[PDB]
Symmetry: C3
Subunit: 351 residues, 3 copies
C-alpha cells in the first residue's frame, strides 16, 4: 500500500491519564524492508494539560525534544547539579542518554505538545525510560535491588527506604504541580525559502553543534491553503515529515525493487510520512498548515527543485541535451520551464 505513511493510529500509548499522555510510533521497519536506514530512530509524542509535571527519569537513548505547541520548563539533573531551561513553541534541545530529566507545563490555560526523536545505540530500535517513581504501571527501578543492597547503600532500615522511596504511588508518571547546550528555535535564522505562498526554515548539522553529533537537520514548513511545495528531492537526507497543524496533500514518487510508484496521502495532525533521499516529493496545503521535518543522514544535504525559476536542475540541462532528453525541442523545453515565475512554493489552485 504505502510503507512510508504512519497514521496517528500506528502509535502505541505508553502512558495516559487525565493529565496527559506519552505515545511511541511503531519501528519504521516493523511493516517494511524499505526503511532499514531508520531502524535506530523512534518518534514519541508527549501531551500534557496545564500545571503538569512529567516525573524524573533517564532514557537509554539520546533525545531531540521539540515544542510543537505551548511552553515547557525542562530540568536536566547531573551528578553535581541541574540545568533549568524554558522551551517556547519552535524550541528544540538534545537530551543526552542517561540524564535524569523532568518536564513541566507551566501554562495555566494552554496544553503542551512535544515531539521526541529518539536516537538509540544500546539496543538499536528500542527506547527505554527509567522512572524513579513507583506507580501502578511499574515499581521504581530502585525496588529491584535486594533488601541488604538497599539497606547498606542508603545506610537505613528497609522499612524507612520502602515507605520513603519505593511504595506504589496513587497517580502515574504525569501529576498536577503546585504554585497552581541551550535550546535553539527552528526559526532562529532567516527562512531558506520564503514568498507569498509558503516559508521553510531549516537548521543543519553544519550550523548547529547539537544536531552535528546526531547528523540531523530540522525544518519548519508554513504554507497558505492552496499553496503547492513544487516537486523536489533531497540528495542525502531522509525526511520524517510530521503534520502539526492543517491538512497536507502529499505526492511522493519512488523506484522500488522494477516499478515506478506514486504514493499519495492527505495528512491530518499527528500523521507522519517518510520522504527517502532521491525520491521526488510535492505537497499541497488543503488548509493553512504547519509541518516539522526531521532529516537523518543530513550532512551535505542539497535540495534539487524540478519546477519553478530558482534551483531547478532541469533548467540547467543545455538545449542540445534537453532536445535528446525530452520529446520537445530544446526551445520548447526551455520556454515551458520559464512559464513558472515563482520558486519553491506556487499557487496550487487548479485551472
Amino acid at each position: 500500500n504505502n510503507p512510508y505513511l504512519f497514521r496517528s493510529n500506528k502509535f502505541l500509548t505508553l502512558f495516559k491519564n487525565q493529565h496527559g499522555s506519552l505515545r511511541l510510533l511503531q519501528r519504521f521497519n516493523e511493516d517494511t524492508e524499505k526503511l532499514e536506514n531508520l531502524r535506530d530512530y523512534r518518534v514519541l509524542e508527549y501531551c500534557s494539560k496545564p500545571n503538569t509535571l512529567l516525573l524524573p527519569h533517564h532514557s537509554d537513548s539520546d533525545l531531540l525534544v521539540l515544542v510543537l505547541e505551548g511552553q515547557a520548563i525542562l530540568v536536566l539533573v547531573n551528578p553535581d547539579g541541574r540545568d533549568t531551561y524554558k522551551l517556547d513553541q519552535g524550541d528544540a534541545i538534545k537530551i543526552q542518554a542517561g540524564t535524569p530529566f523532568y518536564l513541566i507545563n507551566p501554562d495555566n490555560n494552554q496544553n503542551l505538545r512535544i515531539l521526541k526523536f529518539a536516537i538509540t545505540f544500546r539496543r538499536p530500535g528500542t527506547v527505554e525510560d527509567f522512572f524513579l517513581s513507583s506507580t501502578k504501571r511499574l515499581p521504581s527501578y530502585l525496588s529491584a535491588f535486594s533488601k541488604n543492597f538497599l539497606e547498606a547503600s542508603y545506610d537505613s532500615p528497609y522499612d524507612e527506604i520502602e515507605q520513603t522511596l519505593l511504595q506504589e504511588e496513587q497517580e502515574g508518571v504525569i501529576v498536577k504541580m503546585p504554585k497552581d547546550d541551550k535550546p535553539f528555535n527552528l526559526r532562529s535564522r532567516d527562512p531558506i525559502y520564503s514568498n507569498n505562498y509558503g516559508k521553510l526554515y531549516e537548521i543543519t548539522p553544519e550550523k548547529n553543534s547539537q544536531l552535528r553529533d546526531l547528523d540531523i537537520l530540522l525544518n519548519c514548513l508554513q504554507m497558505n491553503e492552496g499553496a503547492l511545495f513544487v516537486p523536489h528531492y533531497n540528495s542525502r537526507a531522509t525526511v520524517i515529515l510530521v503534520a502539526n497543524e492543517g491538512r497536507a496533500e502529499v505526492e511522493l514518487v519512488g523506484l522500488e525493487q522494477m516499478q515506478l510508484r506514486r504514493y499519495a496521502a492527505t495528512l491530518s495532525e499527528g500523521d507522519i510520512i517518510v520522504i527517502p533521499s532521491s525520491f521526488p516529493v510535492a505537497l499541497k496545503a488543503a488548509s493553512d498548515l504547519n509541518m516539522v521535518g526531521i532529516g537523518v543522514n543530513a550532512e551535505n544535504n542539497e535540495r534539487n527543485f524540478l519546477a519553478g525559476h530558482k534551483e531547478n536542475v532541469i533548467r540547467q540541462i543545455p538545449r542540445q541535451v534537453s532536445d535528446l532528453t525530452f520529446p520537445g525541442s530544446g526551445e520548447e523545453v526551455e520556454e515551458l520551464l520559464e512559464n513558472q515565475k515563482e520558486s519553491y512554493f506556487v499557487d496550487g489552485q487548479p485551472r
Copy 2:
C-alpha cells in the same frame, strides 16, 4: 566453489540496445555469509559505442566512476549550473548521490567502458537511477505526479507539459549523439615498479574524494609470466576487476579446527575476485594484463609481503624465533628468504 569469485555472467543486464549496455553485479552477500562487510557496495559496468549519450539521471547512491577504456565527457548538473569534465582512460571521479548527470562517448571509433562503484546508504545494497526521460522500460518519474500538481508546478496546461516533457521520445536511456575534478589512477609514481610489473595506488590519506568513502584505488600492470608474490592487506578488502589479459589468482582463506583452502581461478575481462583483508594472495600473468583494485575499509591499510627482499615480514623474525617457528634452522630460514633478490613482482616461469 569459491564464494569470492564473480564471473562476467553473474552481472544482470539492466539495459542494452545497439548503442551500449548497463550491467549490475549481484550483491556480494547474495550467495554467501562471508561478505557481509560488502553489503553496502554494488558494481556496475557501462559500455557505449561511439557518438552515444547516456540520458540525464540522478542515483540514490554515491558513485565512483572509472574509465577502463576510451574517453568520456561527464556533465554534473547542480541547481545553479553544471560542470563538464573530460575523462581519459584511468580517470576516476566521485558523483555525489542526487547529482543529475549525463555521459557522452565523444570518440568516433573507440568504445567507452566505465566501471561504476556504488556506495549505498538510503537502502543498503540497493542502487536506483531516476531518469527524467520516458522510455519503453519506464515513464519519466515526473509523469507519476497528478495533473493538478504538474499544471500548478509548471504553470502550463497538461497537454503542453505531456507533449514537451512526458511523452516517450527515446526507446532507451542510451541514444545517438549529434567542485573537484577527475584524478588518474597513474597521476602518481607507482608504489611498486620493476621489470615484471607496476602497481599504482591512490589512498584515502592522499585523495579528498576517496577520504569520505574510506576507499583506495590501485592499478596493476604485469608482463606475461610475471608473478605478484604472496602478500596480504592488514585492513582493506580488495575487489579486483580483470580489465585486459588473463590473471591466475591464488587466494588462501582459513574456512571450515579450521580447514585451510586455496581458491584458484583464471580471471578474464570483466571477472571480479574479492580478496578479504588478512587473506594471503598471489597473481600470475598468463598474458600481459591490466587490473583495477577497489579497496574498502582502506584507511591505514598496510601490505605485508611473504616473499621477496622488500616489505617481507618473515625476514623480520629473528633467528632464535624463526628456528622455533619453522622446521629449518634460523640460518637456513634466513638463507632461503634471501634467495629471492627481487621484490613484489618476480619471474613466474616454472623452474
Copy 3:
C-alpha cells in the same frame, strides 16, 4: 534467563597443550537479541606456563591485549622490522589487524594470563588467526599456495621450501623456550583511581585520555574491593561494560527493563565469569571475598557514571525538595533526610544489619 551472564564454561577451547591454552567466548548475540550492540566484539583468554612462546601469527581483527597475571614480552613484526614490548600486570596494548606477533612468558615460576578483546571488521563477529607454523591442527598457510607459485616466489626448489618452511615441526602453536633472552603499553593504574576509600578503588582509562582507546571508542577500568565492601547502585550513560572477574567472588545485581517490565539479574561471579552491564541499567556489586575485576566499556566516548546512593555524584540528591516530594511516596524532607544517611561515596560497608 540471565542473557547478560557468560560463565567460564561458555568459552570454546581453540588450542590447549601442557604449555598453555587459547579460549574464545561465544558471540555476545549467540543466545539473545538483547546484545546486538556487541555483535562485532569477541573476548579471548590466553594462558601460558613459564618459559613459553606463542608462535608468530596475524589476526584479521584489531586486538586490545591486557595482562591479568604475570609478565609478557610482545613482539610486533612490521614489513621493515619489529617492535618489542615488556608487558607487566595491568599493562594493555592495541595490536593492529594484520600485524604478525609472538608472545613470550619470560618468567621461570609464574603463569601468564592475558585478556584479548577482538574488534572485528572483515567478517563482523568472526576472529581468525593465520599461523606461519605447521602444527597438528593446521599446516602453514604458505603450504596452501601451488608448487610453481612457491618455487618462483622464493626462487628455490620446492624441496628446500618444504624442508625449511612447510614441514610440521612443532606439535602446537605454544612451545617451550630454551633461553628467554635469546604507542607503548599503558597500565590500568597509571593515574589516580577516580574512586578510592577504605572499602574499594576504581581506576579508569577513557578514550578522551588515551589515543589507542580513542580509535576503538573503548574505556578500561580496574576494580579492587575488600570482602564485605559494596559498589552502590549506579549506571553508565553511554558505555556498555563487559565486566571480567579476575580474583575473588562478586555478587552482582543488575536491573534492566526487558509492557516492557522490570527485571533483577543477580549472579555471583567466580574467576573467569563475565557479566555485561548495558548502559542506563542500574548495577551494584558486593565483594563476597577480596575482589579484582576488569571492565571493558564499548561506546565509551562521553560516558558519565551516575550514582543513586551515597554523598558524592548522587543524581537523586540533585532533585530539588519540591520535585522529590512529588517523585517519591515520602515527603521532600523525609527523602532529603534518607539520602543524607549514607556518609560514604561509591563504596560502602555491605555487611547486613
